[PDB]
Amino acid sequence: MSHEDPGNVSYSEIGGLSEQIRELREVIELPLTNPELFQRVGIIPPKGCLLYGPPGTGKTLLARAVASQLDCNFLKVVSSSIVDKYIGESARLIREMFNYARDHQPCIIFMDEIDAIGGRRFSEGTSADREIQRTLMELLNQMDGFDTLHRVKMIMATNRPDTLDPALLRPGRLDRKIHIDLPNEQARLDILKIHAGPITKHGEIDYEAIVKLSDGFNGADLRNVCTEAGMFAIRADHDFVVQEDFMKAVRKVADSKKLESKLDYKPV
Amino acid sequence: LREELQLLQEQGSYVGEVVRAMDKKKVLVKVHPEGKFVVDVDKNIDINDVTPNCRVALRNDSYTLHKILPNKVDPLVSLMMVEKVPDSTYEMIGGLDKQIKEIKEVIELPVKHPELFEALGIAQPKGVLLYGPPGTGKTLLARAVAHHTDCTFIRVSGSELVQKFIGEGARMVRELFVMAREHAPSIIFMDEIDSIGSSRLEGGSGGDSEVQRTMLELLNQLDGFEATKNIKVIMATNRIDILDSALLRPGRIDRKIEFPPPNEEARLDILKIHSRKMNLTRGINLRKIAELMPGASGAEVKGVCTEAGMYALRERRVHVTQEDFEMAVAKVMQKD
Amino acid sequence: GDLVGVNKDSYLILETLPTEYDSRVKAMEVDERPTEQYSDIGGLDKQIQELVEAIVLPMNHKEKFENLGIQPPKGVLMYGPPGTGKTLLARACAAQTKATFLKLAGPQLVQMFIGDGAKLVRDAFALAKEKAPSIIFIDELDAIGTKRFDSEKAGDREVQRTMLELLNQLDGFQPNTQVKVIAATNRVDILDPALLRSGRLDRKIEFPMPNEEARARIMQIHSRKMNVSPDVNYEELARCTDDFNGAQCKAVCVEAGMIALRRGATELTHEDYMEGILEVQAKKKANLQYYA
């Protein structure tokens, strides 16, 4: 019950992708405030979506901020609850968790890190892969109703979408597939303003040297670069730092992250 | 009933399962959800009717065995054996008459003849093989020769539930080699898991090449010990890798039968064979109607009658005019 | 809740009893403080400052962060070819800082019963919210972070879901920034790109083989707990070391101390160092013949 995310604004402040903010806005939040728009024209809202990664960041945040933006309604699901125990009884708990997900209207369903509990039947393994499919049956059954369907929005997330099997790879269950791209020039000044936040610096500065030296980075990685440059200030016993020592701490740490950037290639 | 109910009132009364019997008169009891129990005598019915694995009633108080109950062990197996094949006696088989004279002397000899083995000078045959493009009658002939031979027939894999009732760490086909001996002496078959997947025994060897060891070890006992004789097998395959079955068996000692493709002598009688269960007229000539289809498969014989029989099912009349008889041939010629 | 006491079949609860559960899941390992301190590493003073900072700065320097808007690092990736003395250096920094240490390993989260190590982080990070750092240290994050390519699944199943859950509660829940977690890997071959985040791995420094000055240092500073032989130039044993591990340098003084038994004298010479230095590496024990 306690999951919370801001925005509205903080969702639109992520800087990209611009059209993806325009996606789940009217897909998720809009059905509650104006359900008449969809039913009059006759177009059905999507019953599912899939956000993968990480070509950049934003797989979770994109669906996460619009999750509590619909209303105070949300239900958060962690992949740790599906595995349960030996002879796991969570088959009725997946039904129980979704039963109390319908206690919240309109409901929203999350699934994160499905590359674990999404076990593939391609090469037939131990029966643990079978009970994975049984937990999938508990997911689909209640969402196949006979009950609230078009009103509830299910979300799943994965590292790579080769684990979905031909069932989840198909639309229906998993409908929308969206990836993330990089920002552009003069848009770097935009995403910058929202990354300013708590950390402040000298009065006369130009932030373009900071962010340009780090390209293709997580929003927290650039947030780390701002703090890493700010943690160099305490070594200089000053509140701010000149941009010459900035670019030093900016360039060094950034080039160290790029050597760890391997395995960004993901299957389609 | 009131006084007897007071005996059954406290805990009720249970039903146990005896895994083994002792001469000390203590009988082991086992309930399915519960653990194994054991109890002192407990003597009601004659002891000779009490055998391991048999179902027995259980009293609540002394936890003794009140009666003896008929169990089912062979019915389990035999029910799976009747799933794979119908009865299919000699009157249900035809066209193999040349081959049934080849197979009988192998099948009939250990059941009746064997005292003439030493006279004929040949060891007990290890089995028979039938190979050819399907085709049918290879399975129907299994229990056919065995029906008039008076010997009962047991069927084949998958088995498929013998991976629990018989343990996993157990030797499988060696444990099935026990089931054939536990049952009355019978005959076996190979069905089927012979597929076109690409070409190989790769997937068939699980239910075939491993059962090739079953025919050896069964007849090795029958020679050596236990009792009594009468254990046989029949192979069902098509083409290609049968030569590997001839590599496994260097001709010692296997009866020679080549399972034929559908033949004129085969289609003639095997048609009337399947027309005995249905009531039709005699106005149909079985001779020439079989010669117009020199090909396809033996299962097409049943495809003629049954599949095209739905057209006579369309007009709501038990019999149809000759115009449909040519249509019955016209349907089977489009798939050719 | 749960855990409350109630009497037999009367079904009355007298008092609501804490705290959570269960057995080793509640407390993975109880560690007071190590016998060693951060001073035990020679030549690493350049890359220990980055380490010491991220753990120490959120405690004493927190008051300066609210003024300047500074966010303390959470995860740190400490990796190098063994022996790098990583696990000794990590825990030793918790001795002087009073930080309560908790011992945990990656493969320890895999059990027969599914859903064990995954539920542990639900318990582990709940204590990270309850308790103040202190510290948590783990090892072999690279292996357990292996998603393969074609799944499912690996042998690391419970932990690869646990790690990405350990990474998830850092993402979705802001209060999780409490009780910074240290991670350690013995190889960079397999690295999850999701590990990049503020709450996730931030400080990363590649550990190469220490230089000739550092290799001579560490061998002396590992021996400060024991007797150190006099008459040592320290220059010859330093330059003769190429690619030799720091843990092997400890074995140099071992083998040189093992031969001291049969030699009859506990005193060692400067030539005995380079004797045990060339001993363990390159390889053993053969010699070059037939090679012209």
Partner: protein, 348 residues
């Protein structure tokens, strides 16, 4: 007599069958019965506690959860397979024609048991068994001594095959097969035949493939290596072709005697068929001069097969007759069978 009517009130009449978990030096014996229940059992009765060992079928009295004694264990479906003996129905009168091979290994199989005096003075001893190999029956060639070893001590035949036997592998229950048969007598002869590892069409179900079939064979080593086994369990391995055993595996065994039987010659084939037919001939009258002269050449395998169909085709006449046009025509089938693959080569 009186003990039967005495302890019965002390244990029964009703009681349960549990399993043993662990034993404490305080005389409390922890037992576990279905399902998930423990207890402290202190009993001085009938034990025998040392011979028990855990995993046992030991009983648990109803009042209250005490073990009075044991009965027996069968056990499992696994034991019912072989049922002894095997008795010598494969006779030395079914084999013949091999001399230089039959003399040497006859000593090794008879080296234990009789003549113990110079065997114990040695003290190193070769209690490794033997090893066989080779197609088609080269491994079956000296199998006739294994059945000749059924006239005394005990014999065991274990089919190696390829697929059906899988398990973990870990080989947990096949060591049980070897152990339970040696508990009856304890001399032993253990025979393995037809290793298909090189000739596999594919891997079976979820095993491996590739190296996992190798590691269960490496476990087949570690079992057989082995630590720690002293007595016999005489190990005998056989196959059609062995590339399998690593240079490490042959060192424990068989480092002494492994056999190879060359293809038979005119002297062996005549001694093979005449001895095979010593029990039963066909129409008597059989002369072996023209039999080996007509077909040149092939192993004595198919010479029984052509004679199998000889009285079989004559059985259409229900006992005895020979048709000159039909017999040579029926012989043409097997004659061409070997005459399709006649050349190699010039195998030379």
């Amino acid at each position: 007599e009186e003990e039967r009517s005495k302890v019965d009130d002390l244990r029964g009449t009703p009681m349960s069958v549990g399993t043993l978990e662990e034993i404490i030096d305080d005389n409390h014996a922890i037992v576990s019965t279905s399902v998930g229940s423990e207890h402290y059992v202190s009993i001085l009765s009938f034990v025998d506690k040392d011979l028990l060992e855990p995993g046992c079928s030991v009983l648990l009295n109803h009042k209250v959860h005490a073990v009075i004694g044991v009965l027996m264990d069968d056990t499992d479906p696994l034991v019912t397979v072989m049922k002894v003996e095997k008795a010598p129905q494969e006779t030395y009168a079914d084999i013949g024609g091999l001399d230089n091979q039959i003399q040497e290994i006859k000593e090794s199989v008879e080296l234990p048991l009789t003549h113990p005096e110079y065997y114990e003075e040695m003290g190193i001893k070769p209690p490794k068994g033997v090893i066989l190999y080779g197609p088609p029956g080269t491994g079956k060639t000296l199998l006739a001594k294994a059945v000749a070893n059924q006239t005394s001590a005990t014999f065991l035949r274990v089919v190696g095959s390829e697929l059906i036997q899988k398990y973990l592998g870990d080989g947990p229950k096949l060591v049980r097969e070897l152990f339970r048969v040696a508990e009856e007598h304890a001399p032993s002869i253990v025979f393995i035949d037809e290793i298909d590892a090189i000739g596999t069409k594919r891997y079976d179900s979820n095993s491996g493939g590739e190296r996992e079939i190798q590691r269960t064979m490496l476990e087949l080593l570690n079992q057989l290596d082995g630590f720690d086994s002293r007595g016999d369990v005489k190990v005998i391995m056989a196959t059609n072709r062995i590339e399998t055993l690593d240079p490490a595996l042959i060192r424990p065994g068989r480092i002494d005697r492994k056999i190879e039987f060359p293809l038979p010659d005119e002297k062996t084939k005549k001694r093979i068929f005449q001895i095979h037919t010593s029990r039963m001939t066909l129409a008597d009258d059989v002369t072996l001069d023209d039999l080996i002269m007509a077909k040149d050449d092939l192993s004595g395998a198919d010479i029984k097969a052509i004679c199998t169909e000889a009285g079989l085709m004559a059985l259409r006449e229900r006992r005895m007759k020979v048709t000159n046009e039909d017999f040579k025509k029926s012989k043409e089938n097997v004659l061409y069978k070997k005459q399709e693959g006649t050349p190699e080569g010039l195998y030379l």
